[PDB]
Structures are given as C-alpha cells and as structure tokens.
Amino acid sequence: AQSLEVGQKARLSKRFGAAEVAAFAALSEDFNPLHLDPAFAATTAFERPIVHGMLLASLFSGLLGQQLPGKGSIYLGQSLSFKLPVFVGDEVTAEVEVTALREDKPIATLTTRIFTQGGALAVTGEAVVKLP
Amino acid sequence: SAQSLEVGQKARLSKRFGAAEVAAFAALSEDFNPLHLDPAFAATTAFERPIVHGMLLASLFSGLLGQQLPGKGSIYLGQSLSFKLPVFVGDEVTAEVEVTALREDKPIATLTTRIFTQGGALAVTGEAVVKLP
Numbered sequence: 001a002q003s004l005e006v007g008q009k010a011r012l013s014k015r016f017g018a019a020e021v022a023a024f025a026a027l028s029e030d031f032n033p034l035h036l037d038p039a040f041a042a043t044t045a046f047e048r049p050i051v052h053g054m055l056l057a058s059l060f061s062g063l064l065g066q067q068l069p070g071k072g073s074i075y076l077g078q079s080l081s082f083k084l085p086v087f088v089g090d091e092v093t094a095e096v097e098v099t100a101l102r103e104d105k106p107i108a109t110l111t112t113r114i115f116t117q118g119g120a121l122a123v124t125g126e127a128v129v130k131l132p
Numbered sequence: 133s134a135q136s137l138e139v140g141q142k143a144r145l146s147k148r149f150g151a152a153e154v155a156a157f158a159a160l161s162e163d164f165n166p167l168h169l170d171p172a173f174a175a176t177t178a179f180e181r182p183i184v185h186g187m188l189l190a191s192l193f194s195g196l197l198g199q200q201l202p203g204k205g206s207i208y209l210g211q212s213l214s215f216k217l218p219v220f221v222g223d224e225v226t227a228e229v230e231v232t233a234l235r236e237d238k239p240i241a242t243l244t245t246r247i248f249t250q251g252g253a254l255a256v257t258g259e260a261v262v263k264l265p
Binding site for chain 1: 145147149156157160161162163164165166167168173177185186187188190191192193194195196197198199204208209210211212213214215
C-alpha cells in the first residue's frame with residue numbers, strides 16, 4: 001500500500017490506577033466492585049481489584065489512532081480474548097503489529113496484545129482498520 | 133426464587149457520549165485521533181463532524197454484561213466487534229445484549245452485542261463470551 005508494511009510494530013505502557021478504573025466504570029456503566037472495591041476483591045479468588053478487560057483493550061485504540069496507522073485511521077473490526085487478570089495498580093504493555101495489508105483496499109490487519117507486568121499474555125486479538 | 137439464565141433473554145440501555153465523555157475516553161485510551169475531537173479536521177472527512185470512539189461505544193457491553201445480563205459476578209472471556217456506522221458526539225445510542233447460547237460443559241454464555249444509533253441503525257455488532265456469576 002503506502003509506507004505501512006507487514007512487521008511494523010508500535011507499543012505503549014500504562015499503569016491504570018484506581019481513579020482511572022473508576023472513570024472507566026462511569027463511561028462503560030460497569031461498576032463491578034471487583035474493579036473498584038479492595039474490600040470486596042479480598043473475598044474473591046482474585047484477592048485484589050482487577051482492571052476492566054475493555055479498559056485494557058482501549059489501549060489498542062490509542063495505538064491504532066495515534067501511532068500505527070495513526071491519525072485518520074478508522075476501526076473496522078477488533079477481536080478480543082481475555083486470558084489473564086490485570087490488577088489495578090500494575091503496569092501493562094500494549095502492542096500492535098501489522099500482519100497483513102489488503103491488496104485491493106486501503107485496509108490493514110494487526111495483531112493486538114496486552115502483556116502483564118510479568119510478561120504474560122493478558123489480552124490478545126486482531127484489529128482490522130481502514131488506512132489514513 | 134433465583135432466576136436461571138436462558139437463551140433469548142435480553143437487556144439494553146441508552147446513553148449519550150458528549151464531548152466530556154469522549155475526552156475522558158481519549159485520555160484513558162491514549163487515542164487522541166482528531167476524528168473524535170476536531171471539527172475542522174472532521175469536516176475534511178466523510179464523517180464531516182467528530183465521532184465517538186468505536187471502542188468507547190463497545191465499552192457499554194461491559195456495563196450490560198456485568199450489571200444486568202448475565203450480571204453481577206460475570207467474567208469477560210471474549211468479545212468480537214465489527215464497526216459499521218459512526219456515532220456523532222452528543223448523539224444517543226442504545227446498547228443491546230441477548231443470550232444466544234449456554235454451554236453445559238462449563239458455565240459459559242454467548243451473547244449477541246449490538247449498538248444502535250439514535251436513528252435506529254446498527255453501529256457496532258459482535259458477540260461476547262462470558263463466564264457465569
């Protein structure tokens with residue numbers, strides 16, 4: 001297509017804290033105490049509050065919209081598999097990698113992954129986007 | 133008595149994502165794509181005006197799944213999303229989920245998840261897979 005090609009990657013790291021998780025709860029209408037209440041979380045197998053899977057996934061929008069392909073890009077599709085919990089207060093690493101470019105349309109497919117602080121795969125999937 | 137989850141059960145909610153909400157999502161997601169904020173830039177696109185992040189629209193499914201159906205205690209296992217139409221900042225949308233399958237080997241449910249525009253057109257569609265409460 002253009003300067004975009006298979007193999008190009010972009011990443012970012014972010015540590016979602018309690019205030020941010022609460023802000024996302026308000027936007028998403030997902031007020032699960034498991035994400036917001038330390039006392040409640042302690043009564044579950046998670047033991048501590050975990051970040052909304054969709055808050056973790058939002059980072060893919062940051063990568064696609066601000067890095068690769070960047071400004072002007074438009075989401076067409078996104079698949080998401082939630083594998084591991086991410087505890088509030090812990091940092092994660094988000095990464096997108098171009099895996100394919102459609103030959104007859106300005107469309108790209110990228111693998112989207114979220115890694116825990118320990119380097120484990122917490123979220124995985126693929127994004128399909130229209131190029132800028 | 134306790135109400136069992138059943139195929140065909142549904143839930144919905146409506147919400148308006150205005151400038152403040154879109155700005156908050158941009159900050160959380162790190163997605164400051166001008167398509168979602170700048171009217172001058174947006175005017176040069178086929179959308180003509182600022183649109184709400186598709187991933188912000190999709191986040192409403194988390195609210196329905198965790199608060200109503202299946203509800204409290206539900207754990208997200210997967211979510212597929214296809215973005216079909218834009219939602220303009222300030223406009224209302226309706227999020228709808230419906231149970232389509234309940235596995236019997238494990239307490240897992242599959243639900244169709246859709247976002248409709250204020251005009252009644254499909255903006256986002258897909259399926260969620262969740263572990264039961």
